[PDB]
Amino acid sequence: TKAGSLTIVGTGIESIGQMTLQALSYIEAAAKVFYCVIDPATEAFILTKNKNCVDLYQYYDNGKSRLNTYTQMSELMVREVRKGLDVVGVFYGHPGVFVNPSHRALAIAKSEGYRARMLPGVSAEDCLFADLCIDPSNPGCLTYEASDFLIRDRPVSIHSHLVLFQVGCVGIADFNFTGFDNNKFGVLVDRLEQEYGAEHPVVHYIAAMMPHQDPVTDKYTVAQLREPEIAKRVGGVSTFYIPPKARKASNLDIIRRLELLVPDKKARIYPANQWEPDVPEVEPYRPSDQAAIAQLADHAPPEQYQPLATSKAMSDVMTKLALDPKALADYKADHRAFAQSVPDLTPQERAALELGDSWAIRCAMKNMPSSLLDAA
Amino acid sequence: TKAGSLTIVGTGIESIGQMTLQALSYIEAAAKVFYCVIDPATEAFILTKNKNCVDLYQYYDNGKSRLNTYTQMSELMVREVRKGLDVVGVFYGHPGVFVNPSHRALAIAKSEGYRARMLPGVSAEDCLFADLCIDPSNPGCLTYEASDFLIRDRPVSIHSHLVLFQVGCVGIADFNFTGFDNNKFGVLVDRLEQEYGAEHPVVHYIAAMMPHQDPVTDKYTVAQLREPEIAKRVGGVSTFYIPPKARKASNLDIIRRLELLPAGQVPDKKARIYPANQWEPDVPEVEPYRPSDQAAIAQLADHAPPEQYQPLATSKAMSDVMTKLALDPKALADYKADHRAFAQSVPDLTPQERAALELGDSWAIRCAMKNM
Ligand SMILES: C[S@@+](CC[C@H](N)C(=O)[O-])C[C@H]1O[C@@H](n2cnc3c(N)ncnc32)[C@H](O)[C@@H]1O
Ligand SMILES: C[S@@+](CC[C@H](N)C(=O)[O-])C[C@H]1O[C@@H](n2cnc3c(N)ncnc32)[C@H](O)[C@@H]1O
Ligand SMILES: N[C@@H](CCO)C(=O)O
């Protein structure tokens, strides 16, 4: 039961708006905050929400290895944990997606016997899916760091989505405040041409940082990436999306074993991927679609559909547990004592909260029968 | 321009807390809200924020194809757009990650000339990285839908992370209110055994849905997945993580072209980055404080900010308006329509700040907020 803890949170990519409610609540409650963001409005916002913040960005330098910077960032955080304080680290995007020092600091804290947790956030890949209008499900997604992709000769799959981070710093171990001199970029272009061909599309993607900005979603051929004026547009916040070159055929034995039967591989569900070369759009309103739409006119909810049927007192406390870290800590320490303290709950509601199981909370908030809960 | 718009937003996975500030503000501002979420506290919260909501979940049914439900969900949203309304759709997690009807509705709205946008959210994969303590960077990540993975015989990489969604409904095209009868699950287990071997680990992952819950992070062998009591635990909110078998060797041409090692020295001999992946079988222990780490820590005592580091140096008025543009959708729409007229209306801005806002470029905003 050591005093001291480390919680690392994200801010998302687009200024302020892409932070989660829980990231904000933990920042506000912290004894000490350490942050690494690249948007001045987000920095200003953080400084209005906690009185004891330190900017980690000052530990980068011209010609200084990023690994040295990361060791320093982690040590600054853990030093405050060792003094018995509740410390929060903040990184832009998702704090564990292409971020070294967060994973390091949490592992050191855990090894010394302190509580340590990462809260997820909205990454640049999350933004890419939203802005390019693609789903990782169709037809699968491979995600790599650009230098690692080359050095370990990581496998390509020409039938799935490909996403490459850190294309602006190929083979570069250090930092510069004015930007990278990305003079090994041509090595990446050679690999892409060898796998996909000279005329295959590469989408240069930069998510908007400020709320009024449009994203950069510029299509180039692989061969165009050798032109000096195009290559120089690729910087420190650039990600590449490379769409599929072909569609993979279905396995007939698997279709038999799953029992689904010939399958046309070039037969798409609406909408088609706009970035695939020479792929026409599909029909949105086939006869099967029109039949489903006609059924709306006299639709009734199924008998097994259970509408929400809660109270203000119950919704208030469930919201409080999600938005007030201190209330959550009190509940976790003593479910029974906490449940007895909440004003205006019914006997059914109070018993369900003491248990805290999914089945019990659902019975209470949807007015479903339960012999135990109705006996309260 | 044409009246009517569609904005689709997410709620994250863990109840209420994983919703973004902008998802909340767009829900509040909407003329009508359509939602599909799978816990009651999140549903109750949404209903406190807008008086005009419809639950899309009522359009599922026992034995009804999910494709028919998806067509209906998308049509209810687009019908309201065609009436000239600003409509918001809401899906749990990230609204475009393993979600069919959002992409469909947005594509139809855009093709008919209406404004259409998706706002990203926190997905189950984002939660998985945070709870299992892994980074997609190290050593790469492949992500698939479980049935698609099987039907198209999609490749694995034994040297990278593998993440499989929808492992609880293999080959199933319909819906049931009481849950799926996942009787083709053995076909997935056979494929995993062929690619990885019977004793390789598979992590059964379920992110906590309520704020007091712990995640499920249960490691099993591929062979253990054939045991009835274990297979029964895999349901509609289950995801699988399969760690690498081993570390992959480096390409020698690439080491030379990137100038990463002098000739005559043996490659792939540096220790792994700390910390090691705790799920990878036979992973060696990595030490946190090597000589290079201890030297960096010694330098902290007399560290000064570099000359090129630019401290924030802004004002209440400028910070307030940039926050407003992020948190008030109406204010953002006004600003976008006429930058000059909006910037003239803002109270207490300096002439430098007012001009910077009127331009709106990143270089201009940064100049104003760091006093350069
Ligand atoms: C050090 S990593 C940090 C990523 C971050 N934690 C996240 O969640 O996306 C930096 C890389 O993230 C990607 N990135 C950062 N900001 C971006 C943006 N606005 N648009 C596209 N990619 C971005 C680029 O690939 C960049 O080289
Ligand atoms: C229809 S999809 C929707 C995914 C959602 N949009 C997201 O952003 O994660 C359903 C699948 O998501 C995954 N999933 C949903 N909730 C989850 C949870 N609490 N933990 C782990 N995986 C989950 C499972 O693989 C499930 O079969
Ligand atoms: N990962 C590096 C470079 C990203 O381009 C950083 O720490 O910013």
Numbering used by the authors:
A (entry chain A): 7 to 267, 272 to 280, 281C, 282 to 386
B (entry chain B): 7 to 378
From the paper:
While chemical methylation of an amide bond uses a strong base to generate the imidate, OphA, the precursor protein of the fungal peptide macrocycle omphalotin A, self-hypermethylates amides at pH 7 using S-adenosyl methionine (SAM) as cofactor. Omphalotin A derives from the C terminus of the OphA protein, and it is the OphA protein that methylates its own C terminus using S-adenosyl methionine (SAM). The structure of OphA reveals a complex catenane-like arrangement in which the peptide substrate is clamped with its amide nitrogen aligned for nucleophilic attack on the methyl group of SAM. Here, we report the structure of the peptide amide methyltransferase OphA including complexes with cofactor [SAM and S-adenosyl homocysteine (SAH)], cofactor analog, substrate, and product.
The full-length native protein was refractory to crystallization, but an 18-residue C-terminally truncated variant (OphAΔC18), which lacks the sequence that is methylated, was first purified, crystallized, and phased using a selenomethionine variant. Structures with SAM and SAH bound were determined by preincubating the protein with the cofactor prior to crystallization; high-performance liquid chromatography (HPLC) was used to confirm bound cofactor identity. Apart from the addition of the methyl group, the structures of the two complexes are identical [root mean square deviation (rmsd) of 0.6 Å over 684 Cα atoms]. Even with prolonged dialysis at 25°C in the presence of 2 M urea, we were unable to remove SAM from OphAΔC18 to generate an apoprotein (4 M urea unfolded the protein that we were unable to refold). Compared to the Pro242-adenosine (of SAM) interaction in UIIIMT (which binds SAM very tightly), OphAΔC18 makes more extensive van der Waal interactions between Val243 and adenosine. The C-terminal region (Ala252 to Met378) of OphAΔC18, referred to as clasp domain hereafter, is not found in other methyltransferases and comprises extended strands and a helical bundle (Lys322 to Met378). The monomer has the appearance of a ring, with the C-terminal domain forming a thin band, which is closed by interactions between Leu333 and Pro335 from the clasp domain with Leu27 and Ser31 from the N terminus. The clasp domain of one OphAΔC18 monomer wraps around the N-terminal domain of the other monomer, giving the dimer the appearance of two interlocked rings (catenane), a structure that is rare among proteins [reviewed in (20)]. The location of the cofactor relative to the protein is identical in both the OphAΔC18 and OphAΔC6 complexes. Superposition of both sinefungin complexes with the OphAΔC6 Y63F-SAH, OphAΔC18-SAM, and OphAΔC18-SAH complexes shows similar consistency in the protein structure, cofactor, and where present substrate positions.
